[PDB]
């Protein structure tokens, strides 16, 4: 409505905006103006996005580690709507396991597809910020990526070289006003964690000074605030929302 | 007006809000509904903050190194208003030189009005923010506090340590709904800025790979930001908004 | 010769051994009483290995990428010397450009050789540290992992999740005593850096407060402190050797 | 004897040498060849520094929040030793509370201690340092100044402090051969760990990977380490010593 995080005029791409975390960032980018593609990995997944995001964006499937969905999908979303403005990278897997019963295929996807999709997504988006003299790199990490954790090395690994790439993407692009940072999410209620036992739920809280879960749309409103043209001075930085678990 | 980043309802007491970020601070916590009540060191300073948030506040005086001056500050605003539910720690002072040539004044002046002052303003409006279960404490900090600074290492030690006791006090009061963090701007365009002579800004902006100054509203955004409920997740962190000229 | 920082009865595995920082480390650690194997991609490097190592090791081809050859190589060491008490994971790439000059080949070989191979190695010699309990795993890093580097996103983004997996690592298997560290070396003196033009070497200097190159004897002292006795309360760290480049 | 790690031509300065840590770090340097002098706050403690340093140091008092006895020190070592080459800042003090409870002297007490006598005995050995090319300065930090921790917001905040004064002192001085560094212990078994209760070394054990305390002679092992010529392209740098309670 007001001029403040205002999105209006902007293109969102989401990736994974089926539940949690991704549909609450999309809704809220939608929320604030922007017209939001968000993306699932299933026909029925990119529908039931277009049913709840309506006339302010649409769903679409995506296949975050194949280069021809890649480029099929950002055709049909600069053809309808413009050229991407804002990317959030928040499609991610967790293949847990203490690293002697890690297999090769467990490292393998996540590097895929918590690591290298986010280098193939951002380059593929890249050039057409890099024009406008305007753009937002999103990726949605883990706190996990900055403390560490046991049974989890590989997820950990594709997090925080996540960071990586974003400090040296933000390097390459600062001077022609595109940014690229990270929100770092603690322990946030999702299905997923809602599916752990109750020993597992007060042994994590346990670690958490504020107590709770953080809610999904609180992740999205630290997203909605970075893509915001208030935002344009912080680049290279990683957003931890984490209700203290972490304190950088 | 939306229910979108709205302090209606909230106090916000933001210190040195006189001109620059501070000014910048307190304005836009008003637009987003706060009753502020921004300080100056005179009260001629009082009174021209005053006149700049009309209905939407006031201006005091405060003496932020003296505990007579803040305990008269906080009763005149708990009365009026209410007990703080914001306080935005804001008011520094630099005193520069190299190791070899700091005086122990500039040295204790610095830790007085950079780092004690904070103690004592933050212990004053912790106890009613602790019995509401809602509070936020945001220190305006300095990228210097992280990257250090030749010439300024009274500045950043200050800066540094109020991290420090930022991420203590997180941890003290996280569990009742208190989140404390810290701001750390770069280089901002403000008026003491604008005194360096061209080959100083020059060289200063050679580190910035945005290419700029950042401007003080990017600042306010920042902290309007972590005032906000959306922020309720976020303790013990430091945001920096620096256009890339550090990277943590 | 004393009982300080003394590697006697050690195994030690450093790969890329053939020159500069890897030769540095394995020659080091020879000096403090460790039997070290070094590796190298061709034969003849692993003769020249070899031949520098004498009464004090060996030299041995190991492709990193490789299963088999990791395979053959700790059964060939565990036969003549004993299980592998000390890893050092030495050998990295480069394959340098700006983002929309990256190709797909450079990201995936920088993710193979220089991340991939880490969780590969780590993974088979943990066991045996496990058993013993007793360890190090010492990661050669870069301080482009931390601070990011334009035209490095790939680089960055590989040693970063190095870190990322260190700390995981770490927390698995410290109460087991084996800790893993990582070294970040800076701009440091190689064959390579000594093939930059003077502009570039120049440029690189006046960013490194020290005003020199570091020396690969200097990298190689930090990775003997960590594996050694002395260093056993030292796990999930990143020893950052730059000279000043980067200070967190 | 060898050249490894070898002090000997160097004089060091080691504050607070009384016992547990402090003791540890002046033993180690005198083992690797430092002439050393320990402090005390009594003529009765810098007698027993005497006694145990025997001929290779000796033991003074020195009152480090007055610039009277620091300057009395200085000038006795100078004339006996020479100038002082490693100065280890270790002379700290504990004045708990959470932060309501927390007097205005407890928090003051600590700044002088804990912060400006850091200012105060860097500047008056730097000068000596700076003529001669060649310096070290080291600070014993604690996991606290980067962790945080509830009832230490004081603590905290002198040891976050010391840090930012170290970066900014090691870019003031780092192209003149001193590097200035910091080593942060984790939860060191001294007398004072000793006199916790079970409840609280069990509670403070659990936040603890490696699953004990960390010695004092491994703090002294990292101190030496830093203070070694092949240390010299280290610096403003932050070592953590604390199992992996701490992972940054």
Chains 1, 2, 3, 4 share one sequence.
Request: without cysteine; neutral net charge; charged residues 20%.
């Amino acid at each position: 409505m007001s001029q403040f995080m205002n999105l209006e005029g902007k293109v969102a791409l989401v990736t994974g905006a089926s539940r949690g975390i991704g549909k609450a960032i999309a809704e809220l980018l939608a929320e604030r103006g922007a017209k939001v593609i968000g993306t699932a990995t299933s026909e029925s997944g990119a529908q039931a996005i277009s049913d709840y995001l309506g006339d302010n964006g649409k769903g679409m499937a995506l296949n975050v580690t194949n280069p021809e969905s890649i480029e099929a999908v950002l055709k049909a979303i600069t053809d309808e709507f413009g050229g991407v403005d804002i990317l959030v990278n928040n499609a991610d897997i967790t293949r847990d396991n203490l690293l002697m019963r890690m297999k090769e295929e467990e490292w393998s996807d996540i590097m895929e597809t918590n690591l290298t999709s986010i280098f193939r997504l951002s380059k593929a988006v890249l050039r057409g910020m890099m024009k406008k003299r305007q753009g937002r790199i999103i990726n949605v990490g883990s706190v996990v990526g900055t403390m560490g954790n046991a049974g989890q090395a590989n997820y950990a690994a594709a997090k925080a070289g996540v960071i990586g790439f974003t400090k040296s993407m933000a390097r390459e692009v600062a001077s022609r006003g595109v940014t690229v940072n990270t929100v770092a999410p603690g322990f946030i209620e999702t299905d997923m964690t809602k599916a752990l036992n109750d020993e597992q739920r007060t042994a994590t809280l346990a670690q958490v000074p504020a107590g709770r879960l953080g809610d999904p749309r609180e992740i999205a409103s630290a997203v909605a605030f970075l893509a915001s043209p208030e935002a344009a001075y912080i680049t290279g930085e990683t957003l931890h929302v984490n209700g203290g678990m972490y304190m950088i």
